[PDB]
Design an enzyme around this catalytic site. Sequence first.
Site, PDB file in Angstrom:
ATOM      1  N   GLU A 102       0.998  -1.231   0.042  1.00  0.00           N
ATOM      2  CA  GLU A 102       0.120  -0.094   0.045  1.00  0.00           C
ATOM      3  C   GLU A 102       0.871   1.154  -0.013  1.00  0.00           C
ATOM      4  OE1 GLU A 102      -0.814  -2.705   2.114  1.00  0.00           O
ATOM      5  OE2 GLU A 102      -2.659  -3.201   1.527  1.00  0.00           O
ATOM      6  N   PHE A 150     -11.953  -6.818  14.462  1.00  0.00           N
ATOM      7  CA  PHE A 150     -10.816  -7.261  13.584  1.00  0.00           C
ATOM      8  C   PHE A 150     -10.461  -6.275  12.499  1.00  0.00           C
ATOM      9  CE2 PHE A 150      -9.801 -10.075   9.999  1.00  0.00           C
ATOM     10  CZ  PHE A 150      -8.645 -10.529  10.390  1.00  0.00           C
ATOM     11  N   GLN A 151      -9.089  -6.160  12.626  1.00  0.00           N
ATOM     12  CA  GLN A 151      -8.471  -5.115  11.569  1.00  0.00           C
ATOM     13  C   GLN A 151      -9.201  -3.585  11.695  1.00  0.00           C
ATOM     14  OE1 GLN A 151      -8.730  -7.674   8.072  1.00  0.00           O
ATOM     15  NE2 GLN A 151      -6.605  -7.508   7.760  1.00  0.00           N
ATOM     16  N   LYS A 156     -17.645  -0.969   6.059  1.00  0.00           N
ATOM     17  CA  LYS A 156     -18.138  -2.085   4.928  1.00  0.00           C
ATOM     18  C   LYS A 156     -19.664  -2.037   4.719  1.00  0.00           C
ATOM     19  CE  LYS A 156     -17.625  -6.667   4.075  1.00  0.00           C
ATOM     20  NZ  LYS A 156     -16.982  -8.145   3.995  1.00  0.00           N
ATOM     21  N   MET A 185      23.867   9.902   2.290  1.00  0.00           N
ATOM     22  CA  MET A 185      23.689  10.988   2.963  1.00  0.00           C
ATOM     23  C   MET A 185      23.952  11.227   4.244  1.00  0.00           C
ATOM     24  SD  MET A 185      21.940  14.209   2.177  1.00  0.00           S
ATOM     25  CE  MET A 185      20.491  13.866   3.380  1.00  0.00           C
TER      26      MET A 185
END
Lengths: 582, 582
Positions: free
Chosen positions: A59, A121-122, A171, A485
């Site tokens: 993602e 959940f999640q 959802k 760097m």
Amino acid sequence: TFISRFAPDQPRKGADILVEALERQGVETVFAYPGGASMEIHQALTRSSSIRNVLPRHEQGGVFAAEGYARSSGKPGICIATSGPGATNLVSGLADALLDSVPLVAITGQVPRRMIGTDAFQETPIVEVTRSITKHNYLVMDVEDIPRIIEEAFFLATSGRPGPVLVDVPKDIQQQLAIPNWEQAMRLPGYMSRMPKPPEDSHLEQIVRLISESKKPVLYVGGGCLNSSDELGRFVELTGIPVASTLMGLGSYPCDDELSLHMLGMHGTVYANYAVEHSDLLLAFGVRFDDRVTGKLEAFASRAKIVHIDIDSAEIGKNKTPHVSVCGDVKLALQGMNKVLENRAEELKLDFGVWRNELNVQKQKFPLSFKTFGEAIPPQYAIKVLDELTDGKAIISTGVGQHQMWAAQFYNYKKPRQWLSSGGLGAMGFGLPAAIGASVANPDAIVVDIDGDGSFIMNVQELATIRVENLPVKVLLLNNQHLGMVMQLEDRFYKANRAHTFLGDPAQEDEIFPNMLLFAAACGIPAARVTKKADLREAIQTMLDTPGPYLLDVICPHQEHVLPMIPSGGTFNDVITEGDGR
Amino acid sequence: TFISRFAPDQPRKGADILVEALERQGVETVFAYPGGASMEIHQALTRSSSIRNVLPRHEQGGVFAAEGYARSSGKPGICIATSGPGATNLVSGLADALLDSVPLVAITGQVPRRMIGTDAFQETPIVEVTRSITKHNYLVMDVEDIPRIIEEAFFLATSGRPGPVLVDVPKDIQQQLAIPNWEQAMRLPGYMSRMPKPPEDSHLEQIVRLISESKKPVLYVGGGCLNSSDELGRFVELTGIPVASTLMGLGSYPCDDELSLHMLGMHGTVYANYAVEHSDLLLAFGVRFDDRVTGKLEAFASRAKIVHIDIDSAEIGKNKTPHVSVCGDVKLALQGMNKVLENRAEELKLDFGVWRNELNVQKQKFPLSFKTFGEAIPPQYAIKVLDELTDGKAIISTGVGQHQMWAAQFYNYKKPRQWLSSGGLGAMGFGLPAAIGASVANPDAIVVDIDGDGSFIMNVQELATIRVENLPVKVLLLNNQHLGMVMQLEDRFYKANRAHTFLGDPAQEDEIFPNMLLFAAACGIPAARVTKKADLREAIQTMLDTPGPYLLDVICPHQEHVLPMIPSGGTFNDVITEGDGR
Ligand SMILES: Cc1cc2nc3c(=O)[nH]c(=O)nc-3n(C[C@H](O)[C@H](O)[C@H](O)COP(=O)(O)OP(=O)(O)OC[C@H]3O[C@@H](n4cnc5c(N)ncnc54)[C@H](O)[C@@H]3O)c2cc1C
Ligand SMILES: Cc1cc2nc3c(=O)[nH]c(=O)nc-3n(C[C@H](O)[C@H](O)[C@H](O)COP(=O)(O)OP(=O)(O)OC[C@H]3O[C@@H](n4cnc5c(N)ncnc54)[C@H](O)[C@@H]3O)c2cc1C
Ligand SMILES: CCOC(=O)c1ccccc1S(=O)(=O)NC(=O)Nc1nc(Cl)cc(OC)n1
Ligand SMILES: CCOC(=O)c1ccccc1S(=O)(=O)NC(=O)Nc1nc(Cl)cc(OC)n1
Ligand SMILES: Cc1ncc(Cn2c(C)c(CCOP(=O)(O)OP(=O)(O)O)sc2=O)c(N)n1
Ligand SMILES: Cc1ncc(Cn2c(C)c(CCOP(=O)(O)OP(=O)(O)O)sc2=O)c(N)n1
Ligand SMILES: [Mg+2]
Ligand SMILES: [Mg+2]
Ligand SMILES: [Mg+2]
């Protein structure tokens, strides 16, 4: 006149409303990664014949792809994720899009509304998490708010000072049936009332007046001028003022021009910083006065009358109090100031050749230099080869580090939105996914990722995305086997004491590790590794001529330092002009 | 008696105080990725002779490594990142550590204090972002608060219900000089006053009393018992109650035992769910009554007197109101209830063989089954081979998906902290870095990552970490060329309509893509790909016997479904016992 795939009286799933809401916004490319809390959206995406999904392998790669899509086209970039871990993987992209003012709309799935707040959940409060790293965010509590929220999200993400807007969709909303009302009025009264108005000629003429009274003026162009490409050029003709650009504004005014001072700031040219340090009029158009540009604010342009134009009223007077200020679109300010400079052409004794030839002295005394040891490939030269072999007309994305600075110094970008780089947040692994998004937004353009061995490996999984989606992304990897760097700051300020900055294998320290060519091989991408400066030109030419993706592992001596360098919190009288870890 | 590397009166940098503060906490392994805002900490880390740094290739890999370090040892896992993009890359790990109650301490560098709030270079409000996904967080505003804040952070992260604690340290604090006061009192009055006390025998005897009055009791063991391994076993001897474990509590009571019901819940065994559905006493020890375990709460154990023990007073009565409750350490509750069950041995007619033989009927009628088509490797069988070839004594980490469920169903974990898997947040890419942390915490243990082709590639860059650090991490990759768990939900509820769930190359759909073996090759890791079930046993044996890292690409038919399955929001009367996408 939009043509819906559903009847105007036919109930449809909320997810089908969400996708149609994107279609009506002109969306044709999204970067969605599926999950349980967003399968309804993904199903509705397949039913759409106008919206394409580029499935990333992470993602963070999806949101960075939406960034590169946006930075290379001016359109808003759209990424979609599922609840919980899918949403948390967008955080870096959101904070990055906010700091660089990139128009972006992120849509995350969420647990059903009855489940929110139960540690389900999640289930993470992605709205509570991203509120400080987004321009705005939403939580859709009813299916009928979808058409309005999407319209507000795209409007907020693209208007004014652009930024990222997150829309959390539960959802059950995606599954609920409704007939969308596509003509709701956006509940944004307080925002539009403070949207900047076209600039008054009162301020515009006082600026033109201050230009004629000035003898050493400098243009301070930044990311705010990416759409004022032509207006800025016409303004430079009428004044002849040199143009010092920032890392974000690169390309607004061509780097190959004799009036261009290239980049100013910490790793900006010695002459561009000089012009600002000894100027009487500083025309800051579309900049936010970064510490990476000013250092010590009291010492920054301490002899110049500062004229600041910015579409964000908060940035005006934030870090340096200007003499004159104009809250509004810098595009209109240039248009207005151009008309004043034509009808007052002969009236205004506009000739700064005394000031320019003072800079062209400093320009040829302290130019951008690089040493060339033996046959070892100097990274600065490798980029200058890519500039020549592509005629400077190639879209360039970078990671973060030395290779990011050299990609800025030693490439002459002729148009804006050709230079994609994380500046505000400076997030490694930005290069490879941004090249994915830019290639989809500009299919017939040369897209080259100038990544570093550290930044490249962070989102190396997106090589599968490049192959599967068949995108002609060229990877010019500047492999120095180090986090250069951070290594440079170790050499300078910590007596070259390496503190976890070597990325290769210590058991075989003289072997390039990892073998980046095999990463490209795993994803069916042709690769090659150049080592000697003689072979460098032919290798880059092969990378460009070979159709499709291509990875070119360019090995470089690791002791190189990015120069010049103004230490953080210093002034122009501290600019380090030479030195490296040898 | 700690031995400092500095004199008790010698001023030292704040970063040297921070590292010493970790040393005094028993820290010997951190996962730090360097950056400009944390170079002072990294320099001080090299000066430490007792703390080892495992440099990851991505901060998300660094925090997940700290998780696997913590989950496999009970110690707190320590990860360090720089400001801005380095800190935002820890978000998923923090939210994951919070939902699964993993003791974790994350230290992020921050811009100097005078710069905070000015949208400075690489400045994100990481404290404001992570407040909702951490047990607690800090922002060090003075160098003298370092010894106290670190002590509070480790105490809060490890005591009570464990969780992640973030400590943001500005750069100027790291550079400031001070003499640390190592005996400051922790400003935690409100926390310690509510820390649970040892359980009263009043509640404990009423539980033992309710056990004797019960005829169909079930143990509901979860992640709260990972330290009560022996106490739980001795409690089972004295009662003979079957043990249904959750995905987090796997290993607390051995899966290979005749009293074990294995896992209950959505993808839990048909018999373990049956035992709960028809029970009169539910002994919920160290669980949080997840929706992934209960589904419809009204239907969950709707005939049982619920006894809930939990160290978090908030979880008691959160989703299901119990009859009896005990706020406290389940370890002490077992110790107390064991003494009551010995001195009342013959007094209590404790024999549930009538109840057990009712379950052993359901146990042999609905066991864990898997089809075996031709020579195609069934993933369930591949894991059962790994169980046999490792004697069930191997530390197993997983990604998220089907391969995560099969790794739970078809492996008999004999001790807790042997099973490392993201349960609450269910974050893909957890497997490979968690295997890194567990291997460093348990150097002489068999550590095997049972990853999936989607989860594995998300943090595939950590293969460089495994090679460079020379860790014997075995990667048992269950390559099904799909995001199988999302694919299964497509087959069931969306008529097998693929919506971006195929991870291979569509141009050559019958070619395994990406070639995961070349990913291992790029990082100098020996690899192999097994395809036929006959060769599977020899291949896994080679992976185990080959010293160092090893990747085994196990190809599997993609149409497999995880069974059984209770649809989300359903009851036991909906458990799907067979079916796949064919
Ligand atoms: C390692 C590293 C080193 C760096 N060093 C340097 C350096 O030496 N030099 C350098 O320049 N950068 C450097 N940066 C990049 C950096 O941190 C900032 O992005 C940059 O300094 C500031 O960009 P900017 O102010 O020009 O424009 P932006 O940061 O993009 O801000 C845009 C500004 O213009 C305004 N604006 C936007 N649109 C309009 C419009 N239509 N009309 C009017 N105003 C508008 C916005 O309100 C905002 O105030 C470095 C980055 C990294 C990662
Ligand atoms: C794809 C997927 C499918 C899943 N399906 C299932 C499934 O079918 N079955 C399943 O079980 N899980 C499943 N989960 C995992 C899941 O979402 C939760 O992690 C799990 O359901 C709940 O774990 P737990 O309640 O047993 O313990 P935890 O979630 O770890 O919570 C610990 C509880 O014990 C308490 N506690 C901690 N320490 C102590 C102590 N010393 N003394 C007393 N109490 C203490 C804490 O206060 C807390 O209330 C799945 C996960 C995924 C990713
Ligand atoms: C993970 C998505 O979270 C939810 O949507 C969710 C959460 C809690 C209770 C019910 C639902 S639900 O019934 O509305 N839908 C699901 O639970 N979907 C779902 N998706 C995946 Cl990938 C896995 C899963 O359980 C294994 N379940
Ligand atoms: C990126 C870290 O941010 C800072 O610490 C910071 C920020 C704004 C102003 C001054 C500083 S500082 O003087 O305290 N230190 C630095 O700026 N260090 C620094 N690190 C990196 Cl890697 C790059 C950089 O500028 C290129 N500068
Ligand atoms: C995700 C992340 N972590 C840390 C940093 C801090 N950081 C780091 C670690 C740099 C060195 C990058 O190494 P590289 O190989 O990608 O590029 P060069 O070595 O050519 O500079 S530059 C910089 O600001 C960062 N920008 N992003
Ligand atoms: C980072 C992230 N994104 C999305 C999800 C949602 N998700 C996804 C995308 C799953 C399928 C994982 O595919 P896999 O190849 O890793 O494993 P299997 O195909 O064997 O199930 S399971 C699941 O909960 C997730 N858990 N984590
Ligand atoms: Mg990654
Ligand atoms: Mg490098
Ligand atoms: Mg898979």
